[PDB]
Design a protein around this motif. Structure first.
Motif, PDB file in Angstrom:
ATOM      1  N   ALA A 344      20.344 -17.934 -18.226  1.00 21.11           N
ATOM      2  CA  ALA A 344      18.940 -17.547 -18.315  1.00 21.11           C
ATOM      3  C   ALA A 344      18.122 -18.673 -18.937  1.00 21.11           C
ATOM      4  CB  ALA A 344      18.790 -16.262 -19.129  1.00 21.11           C
ATOM      5  N   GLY A 345      18.706 -19.276 -19.988  1.00 23.61           N
ATOM      6  CA  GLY A 345      18.016 -20.351 -20.659  1.00 23.61           C
ATOM      7  C   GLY A 345      17.789 -21.575 -19.765  1.00 23.61           C
ATOM      8  N   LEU A 346      18.757 -21.908 -18.940  1.00 21.83           N
ATOM      9  CA  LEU A 346      18.605 -23.033 -18.008  1.00 21.83           C
ATOM     10  C   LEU A 346      17.582 -22.741 -16.915  1.00 21.83           C
ATOM     11  CD1 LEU A 346      22.390 -23.882 -17.499  1.00 21.83           C
ATOM     12  CD2 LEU A 346      20.730 -24.884 -19.043  1.00 21.83           C
ATOM     13  N   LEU A 347      17.370 -21.460 -16.587  1.00 22.13           N
ATOM     14  CA  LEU A 347      16.428 -21.072 -15.536  1.00 22.13           C
ATOM     15  C   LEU A 347      15.030 -20.915 -16.125  1.00 22.13           C
ATOM     16  CD1 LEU A 347      18.438 -18.453 -13.421  1.00 22.13           C
ATOM     17  CD2 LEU A 347      18.404 -20.900 -13.262  1.00 22.13           C
ATOM     18  N   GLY A 348      14.891 -21.199 -17.431  1.00 25.98           N
ATOM     19  CA  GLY A 348      13.592 -21.231 -18.023  1.00 25.98           C
ATOM     20  C   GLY A 348      13.285 -19.994 -18.858  1.00 25.98           C
ATOM     21  N   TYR A 349      14.323 -19.193 -19.136  1.00 31.95           N
ATOM     22  CA  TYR A 349      14.160 -17.958 -19.888  1.00 31.95           C
ATOM     23  C   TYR A 349      14.789 -18.092 -21.273  1.00 31.95           C
ATOM     24  CZ  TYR A 349      13.443 -16.147 -15.055  1.00 31.95           C
ATOM     25  OH  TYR A 349      13.051 -15.916 -13.731  1.00 31.95           O
ATOM     26  N   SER A 350      14.113 -18.781 -22.181  1.00 32.21           N
ATOM     27  CA  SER A 350      14.666 -19.064 -23.483  1.00 32.21           C
ATOM     28  C   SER A 350      14.784 -17.833 -24.361  1.00 32.21           C
ATOM     29  CB  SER A 350      13.759 -20.023 -24.191  1.00 32.21           C
ATOM     30  OG  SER A 350      13.577 -21.201 -23.439  1.00 32.21           O
ATOM     31  N   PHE A 351      13.799 -16.946 -24.174  1.00 31.83           N
ATOM     32  CA  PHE A 351      13.665 -15.753 -24.999  1.00 31.83           C
ATOM     33  C   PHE A 351      14.494 -14.646 -24.353  1.00 31.83           C
ATOM     34  CE2 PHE A 351       9.599 -18.211 -24.851  1.00 31.83           C
ATOM     35  CZ  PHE A 351       9.806 -18.919 -26.028  1.00 31.83           C
TER      36      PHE A 351
END
Ligand code: GAL
Ligand code: GAL
Ligand code: GLA
Ligand code: GLA
Ligand code: CL
Ligand code: CL
Lengths: 508, 510
Positions: A344-351
């Motif tokens: 998720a974080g790599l796809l731009g979803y840090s939160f």
């Protein structure tokens, strides 16, 4: 338009869909379709490789790995890119900055600075004032920190009526005031569906803010359609808002703004919006695809800093909380939390918040106490931590204590979580990072039971039964934060564990 | 399909099939009525009756056309032509009734007849709330109108299939009912068989398998294995719907309605919807019945609640159900339908007929025409039942209001007569409101639809157009105008000077 990409020797590919991360790196035979499909969670038209390569399109595509070759079929246009640094991190960083740059903003910090609590598993469809207040009092009384409380589905009379059902909430304003006083913030579950024989349905039909039925006509235009689309979803059959219609946005804002003004609601859990609900004989005002309907539902959250979404298309780099989907009460599913969250974080979803401790699928609810503890310990040093089933009700005293100890470790570690959460706002760099992201080309490509909190803390939650846990340390020295024992890096170690161990190491 | 092709006898006139088509009868050359899947927005019966004592019946739906002088019927099942030996419409009615829809012996709750009824629909429409309902009831009393049955119409509940008062608009529904009872009213609630298809009630009904299922257009799929509900488009939107063939749906409906009576003291129920058309298409029912029979079986629920009313119906002639004429427009054309529709209703076995709502029952209408409202009230007055909705005191000036009050007073004066024939209709099925042809056969009354007989002895000729003159066709015999006392010889047509207050009514004295 199509694209064939031979893998580089040893190259590993991730991307496309958060809820497929356990199947990655993409294997021979693998297939992911994004067109009309977010796979039950968040999805993005991005692939990233361990060699610093990336694939982007503005629009959906399908990807298949046949032997050692990726075949990608784009509905629009796409391309292969190489970042010169040659690592996963470099691919992430170039793709983010070109295609989903960090907005500079955070979701409401109350979502991070305490655990979250969701009434769904404890109360299911019987959302009522007395039981919600009791759950809240119970959180406090058992020594858990007050945080964001999410009142889940069915607090309202019917879908599309944005008011508390007075039969079950005699004084909702009073309830919210009491919750605020106890240190909780409150979110409500909302969705874009409308019970299709009600006053709200007829109003939305008259305002033309619903999706219309095409009747399978090639030629019928939105401006002339008369009947609403009816969509089957997990609660039944409903009309649905047309997220391409500016008037739907206005309507949604009036509803949400009203709940904030009238009752003091802090924010909203945005349910549904999955691309699949927008397929078939449907006419939208601006002629957008199913994926972009999902994306535009996601944009509503940009106006409500306290938000959460399960279903998403794009909106990488944005101040939305992205929850991993309903997890089953299984060991299989607790082992998804890390690879799903890291992708998720790599796809731009840090939160990213990892669903609900112990499981988020209401049908599951003989419970496994150990699983609940290991689920809680895995949440603890993730960007956010979310309870639903009441630990004091379903756990015996020492399992409960171990959950409390997890919460305590989160408290000790919160300054670190918040440093990297605040930075994520600015740069998009994830809070929870894969081992590969931080330690490229060191044999961590398939290590999915460990993650880095920022650059300096290695977390290795216990995710099976047994008194032994193996931990692969990168080169360097590593100090276990509880025991204080220092380990030489560059090897795999065996650690004796108990129900209460949450292995975590500081880089020295 | 099996069929009959019937040459008309000389001068023969035919009525039947569908209440809401009565204005088009006697059946003319070029007429067509389809009953299969179609109750024409009201009550329908597989019966035709003639002025020569002939009748056609089938247990099952049919279509009927007249081409020239041939009446043709095509049956879904089987049917037949019969002749009553006395040779009149009344003989055909009487034989058909005794063979095919005998009187049950029972009456609907007598409070539906012994006072005017009041329905909140036109006054409040979708804004049904405790304060406004109590105000309407207080306004009835304050304006000198009698307390009667008060019907709380559509939208008193949170959503379709939730049988509870919405606490947002009804903070103390039990206390409201208690108040209404002490003011001398009884209270009915609007109920229907539709379920908001994404709600708790829907999911419960789906789990209990009491809804109608979606066949998917499959010919082989059996009820037992279907998984998805039928979704039905109706005037309020899209809904799941109860399967009236399923005994478990009856149980569920009884639980809901008995619950409302026990908890809130509700006296009865207005049974909405049930139209055959709602049951057509890709649908699977537990007992494999047709669309018309789904309508019929909804109608049977009312056999358990003596205080009832229905608009949609198939069969159930001779039964203790109030049958309301459908929503009437605020037009002169529609006020002229009340008599021929009500008289046909009686011949088809629906003695307890109420002529919709005074001044109109179509909410979209609501230039109100005050005179039309008056004439509507006066037409209702000597019908079996009288129903208000729009508030006479709000929409009428003082003369017009007073004329409505005078109509209520005439009904009070005439009530012993109404009740005598209402109680008799329970036993024999003989209509309360009778056509001129029924009482006076072969005397030229076949197309007289602006007069009716209240029982045998009272000829009512309400004013149903503008103007100061009213023509009235008197059967042979002597007729005394009940206000003036003037006696008129019959076998001719008289012209009466009329005012806004006039309700021409004649007692048979020979
Ligand atoms: O996709 C979201 C849905 O997931 C289902 O598996 C679950 O039973 C529902 O409660 C809903 O959350
Ligand atoms: O058929 C019954 C329906 O008739 C319509 O004309 C009317 O607008 C609705 O309110 C409903 O009563
Ligand atoms: O129907 C309620 C249910 O819907 C789905 C969500 O993913 C769950 O968390 C819960 O909100
Ligand atoms: O929707 C409400 C409306 O439905 C139809 C009925 O015939 C009317 O009398 C009224 O009850
Ligand atoms: Cl679904
Ligand atoms: Cl309709």
């Amino acid at each position: 338009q199509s694209l064939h990409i031979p893998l580089l020797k040893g190259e590993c590919w991730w991307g496309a869909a958060v809820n497929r991360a356990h199947d990655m790196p993409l294997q021979p035979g693998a297939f992911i379709q994004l067109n009309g499909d977010v796979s039950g969670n968040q999805a993005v038209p991005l692939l990233l490789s361990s060699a610093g390569r990336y694939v982007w399109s503005d629009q959906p595509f399908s990807v298949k790995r046949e032997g050692d070759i990726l075949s990608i079929s784009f509905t629009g246009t796409g391309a292969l890119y190489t970042a010169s640094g040659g690592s996963l991190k470099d691919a992430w960083g170039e793709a983010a900055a070109r295609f989903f740059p960090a907005s500079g903003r955070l979701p409401d910090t109350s979502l991070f600075t305490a655990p979250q609590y969701n009434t769904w598993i404890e109360l299911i469809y019987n959302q009522n004032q007395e039981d919600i207040l009791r759950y809240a009092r119970d959180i406090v009384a058992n020594g858990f920190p007050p945080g964001v409380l999410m009142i889940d589905d069915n607090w309202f009379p019917y879908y599309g009526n944005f008011s508390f059902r007075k039969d079950r909430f005699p004084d909702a304003a009073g309830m919210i005031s009491t919750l605020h006083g106890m240190g909780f913030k409150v979110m409500l579950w909302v969705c874009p569906f409308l019970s299709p024989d009600t006053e709200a349905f007829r109003e939305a039909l008259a305002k033309r803010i619903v999706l219309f039925d095409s009747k399978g006509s090639d030629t019928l235009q939105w401006q002339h359609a008369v009947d609403p689309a009816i969509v089957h979803w997990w609660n039944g059959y409903s009309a649905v808002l047309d997220g391409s219609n500016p008037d739907a946005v206005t309507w949604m804002r009036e509803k949400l703004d009203g709940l904030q003004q009238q009752y003091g609601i802090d924010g909203f859990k945005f349910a549904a919006g999955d691309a699949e609900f927008y397929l078939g004989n449907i006419l939208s005002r601006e002629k957008i695809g199913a994926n972009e309907q999902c994306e535009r539902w996601g944009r509503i959250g940009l106006l409500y800093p306290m938000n959460e979404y399960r279903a998403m298309w794009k909106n990488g780099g944005q101040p939305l909380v992205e929850r991993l989907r309903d997890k089953y009460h299984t060991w299989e599913d607790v082992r998804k939390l890390i690879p799903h969250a890291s992708l998720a974080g790599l796809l731009g979803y840090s939160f990213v918040c990892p669903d609900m401790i112990g499981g988020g699928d209401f049908s599951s609810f003989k419970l496994d106490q150990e699983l609940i503890v290991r689920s809680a310990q895995c949440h603890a040093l993730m960007p956010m931590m979310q309870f639903s089933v009441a630990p004091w009700r379903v756990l015996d005293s020492s399992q409960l204590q171990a959950v409390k100890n997890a919460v305590a470790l989160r408290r000790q570690m919160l300054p670190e979580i918040m440093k990297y959460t605040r930075e994520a706002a600015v740069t998009g760099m994830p809070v929870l990072r894969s081992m590969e992201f931080v330690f490229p080309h060191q044999g961590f490509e398939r290590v999915e039971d460990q993650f880095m909190l920022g650059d300096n803390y290695l977390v290795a939650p216990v995710l099976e039964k047994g008194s032994v846990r193996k931990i692969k340390l990168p080169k360097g020295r590593w100090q276990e934060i509880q025991s204080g024992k220092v380990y030489r890096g560059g090897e795999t170690i065996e650690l004796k564990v108990t129900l209460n161990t949450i292995p975590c190491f500081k880089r020295t």
